[PDB]
Amino acid sequence: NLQDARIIIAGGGIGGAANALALAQKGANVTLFERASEFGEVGAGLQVGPHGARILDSWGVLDDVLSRAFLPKNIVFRDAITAEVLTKIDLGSEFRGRYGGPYFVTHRSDLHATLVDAARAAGAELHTGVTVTDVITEGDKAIVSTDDGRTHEADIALGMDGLKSRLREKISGDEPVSSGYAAYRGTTPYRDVELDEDIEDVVGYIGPRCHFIQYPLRGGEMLNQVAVFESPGFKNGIENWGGPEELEQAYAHCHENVRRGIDYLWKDRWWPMYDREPIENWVDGRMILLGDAAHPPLQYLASGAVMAIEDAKCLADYAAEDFSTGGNSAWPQILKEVNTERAPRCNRILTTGRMWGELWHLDGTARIARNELFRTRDTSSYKYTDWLWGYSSDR
Amino acid sequence: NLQDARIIIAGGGIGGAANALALAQKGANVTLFERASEFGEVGAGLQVGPHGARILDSWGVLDDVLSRAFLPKNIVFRDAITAEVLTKIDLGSEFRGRYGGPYFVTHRSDLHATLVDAARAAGAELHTGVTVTDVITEGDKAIVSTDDGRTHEADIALGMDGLKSRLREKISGDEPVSSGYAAYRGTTPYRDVELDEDIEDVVGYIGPRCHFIQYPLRGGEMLNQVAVFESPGFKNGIENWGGPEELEQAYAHCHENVRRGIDYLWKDRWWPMYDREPIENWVDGRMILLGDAAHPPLQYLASGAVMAIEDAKCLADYAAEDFSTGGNSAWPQILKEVNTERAPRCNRILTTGRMWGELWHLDGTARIARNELFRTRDTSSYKYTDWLWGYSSDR
Ligand SMILES: Cc1cc2nc3c(=O)[nH]c(=O)nc-3n(C[C@H](O)[C@H](O)[C@H](O)COP(=O)(O)OP(=O)(O)OC[C@H]3O[C@@H](n4cnc5c(N)ncnc54)[C@H](O)[C@@H]3O)c2cc1C
Ligand SMILES: Cc1cc2nc3c(=O)[nH]c(=O)nc-3n(C[C@H](O)[C@H](O)[C@H](O)COP(=O)(O)OP(=O)(O)OC[C@H]3O[C@@H](n4cnc5c(N)ncnc54)[C@H](O)[C@@H]3O)c2cc1C
Ligand SMILES: [Cl-]
Ligand SMILES: [Cl-]
């Protein structure tokens, strides 16, 4: 266990919160700083596959999370132009038995609040309204500086400050890479959505230069909707690219079921999709980057938060194993071994994520080949997903 | 039978020759004009699937054709970059039993000379060095005019003057549509080709913006090679586009096995690939367009000559059925019914041919989807080919 260990965490997103929980359950002294004045996430959906669900269960928060979540029966891919079913992934008992947990969807906000509360209950000291301005290593401590003039000593620091991380600059000067696709969200009361059929699945309509995703939340009361389209604005160098004026032209070619959905999206806010080129080294002395700071993906595999949750389990588990026997001295070896386990796993998600996305968005004859590939696959095979959903950091 | 029928044929390619044979065996009086001073075809390979082979057998020339032909065991598709096998079509006894004949390859010249000789032996009067300058219909005859000042009377005329048909202009003012791909050919003595493995198959290497095809001829003594690549020259408006100066850059990205092959191609002559938009009506009075005059395809399905051979059987069969009972009067009804049978069949080849070609030439993620589609298909299924190889005009 981690009794005498002091850890500081810069950033209190899903990733920071999950690390505070995982370390604090091991007996670590955890201090986390979050810039915004409250802990909060977007009131829209996210997907958490069994690779996350397992981990949440091992912290004892899955039952609670599930009580406010939705359990879809399948992931259903449809053609965005014809609305025809291309294939299904069955999320039933075979699926759960193979991967050790359910595939679920919930409100990001509720998942987030659940992790913050349990991290608090486990002993983490969380601070809102505090910006980390610098981290350096000196001797065998991490020295962390905040925007209220104070400095702080810890055994290690976690840089969990997101896609636009400033702590990343200690390790790499790369910048976010635009995909040229923008995401819009919406949650609707379920009844109030004009639906031809009912939805108890995660449904992905995939089309030339767009996609459209739908799933129920909170026991089938609301329906989460997500639209992702290639921005003509981005190619012409617009700075605030992907605005709602592009929406109607982007989906004009698509099936009515897809076009109906555009109306329910929040138009006052959207998410341009950037990621970063994969990097191998995430450690600077006694600082490690985790979460989106280390490995921000495009969202086609629905796995970025999950990756940050894995980061949390791997770090907590590996430190608990080596700290008991090696003390504060052992911290850099711990970080290196976390880095080594986590880098290939996460970097394959970033790279494969890009290829998966391109596969969704193909046109012409390429679309016809892709449709046929999907329809005719062996649905009892798990070769396309074991690497994703069947990973574990356990050694 | 066709005893009292007089038919004139403008053009003595594979298609004209095959029609002279088919009509003359029914007892028709056949006159064919060929522009060039000799009957002759390119001394390079072509492929004749069972949809052609059957028909050649029913004229009694298949045994003879096969005695100088090659019988491949499979059609093997490989990736042009890795040289990996993607899939095979088995050409064995199941294949032959289902489709009623062999898939074979031979020299175009030898197939051509075989059809000319049998058409002669069957009573067709063939004339070289004679250009048809016009065909009109007047009353119940076709009036055909030649470049030696003469005119000629017949019950019907066949416009079989090729891709660049001038007789087509009576029915349509459309022009050939460039694909932007050029084909090069080569026949090598088999031994003299540097081969890693031996080849007893039709092999197609398919790659981004190119392909490369190889098969043995004449009992495995020579190896036919064909290179097809997208011409940068064509996009920039070059008039004589697709020259051999493009070859090395076109295949630079491809596997060594593909690059080795470029060296054996004839460089003094190449074939820019044009086709035409499909048309429904091929008949002007007592003239019918057939062969490439009516339906010129891109060569990805290896079926243009075959289509002209089918044209021959269908016309001969349908006329033999209706002429015996209805005489010269019946000729326009005969042409219409030939047209109606043949148009959808051939026009699906032109359109699907284009899509098939695009499928060969895909790049990036589209290439990865296509490769995987090919590898994982059900090889006992015949759904991708029945429509092609299992067609018959018989009613
Ligand atoms: C449209 C969309 C859909 C998605 N869907 C899914 C999905 O379905 N499933 C899934 O698993 N993932 C999904 N993701 C990815 C997922 O949202 C992210 O990977 C994940 O939230 C990253 O969490 P994080 O804690 O590492 O970073 P963030 O959530 O960005 O949190 C960083 C935090 O640090 C704070 N901060 C920044 N700088 C400082 C500083 N100097 N000091 C203190 N605090 C600071 C920020 O305020 C923020 O709270 C999606 C992403 C998008 C864009
Ligand atoms: C690279 C390549 C590979 C191919 N491979 C294959 C294959 O493997 N299998 C296959 O089945 N098909 C193949 N084809 C297609 C095939 O070659 C043609 O579809 C077929 O030859 C057309 O025959 P045709 O008799 O209709 O026209 P053509 O062969 O063009 O013959 C027309 C004839 O009429 C003559 N002529 C022109 N004008 C006049 C006039 N006014 N009067 C008299 N005569 C005239 C010409 O001299 C010529 O001899 C391929 C084509 C190419 C370009
Ligand atoms: Cl994601
Ligand atoms: Cl052809």
Residue numbers in the entry:
A (entry chain A), B (entry chain A): 3 to 397
Paper text:
To shed more light on the role of these lipid guests, bearing in mind the different lipid compositions of Gram-positive and Gram-negative bacterial membranes, in the present work we produced Rj3HB6H in a newly developed R. jostii RHA1#2 expression strain and, in addition, 3HB6H from Pseudomonas alcaligenes NCIMB 9867 (Pa3HB6H) in E. coli. Biochemical and biophysical characterization revealed that Rj3HB6H possesses similar catalytic and structural features as 3HB6H, but contains PI as glycerophospholipid ligand. The three-dimensional structure of Rj3HB6H was solved at 2.3 Å resolution by molecular replacement. The isoalloxazine moiety of FAD was refined with full occupancy in the in conformation. Similar to the crystallographic analysis of 3HB6H, no substrate could be detected in the active site of the enzyme, despite presence of excess 3-hydroxybenzoate in the crystallization drop. The protein crystallizes as a dimer, just as 3HB6H, and contains a phospholipid molecule in each subunit. The electron density of the phospholipid in the crystal structure was refined as two acyl chains, one of twelve and one of seventeen carbon units. The phospholipid is located in a tunnel, which runs from the dimer interface to the active site, and interacts with the opposite monomer. The phosphate group resides at the protein surface near Arg350 and Lys385, and the electron density of the headgroup is consistent with the presence of a cyclohexanehexol moiety. The crystal structure showed that the inositol headgroups of the phospholipids are located at the protein surface, and that the sn-2 acyl moieties are in contact with helix 11 of the other subunit.
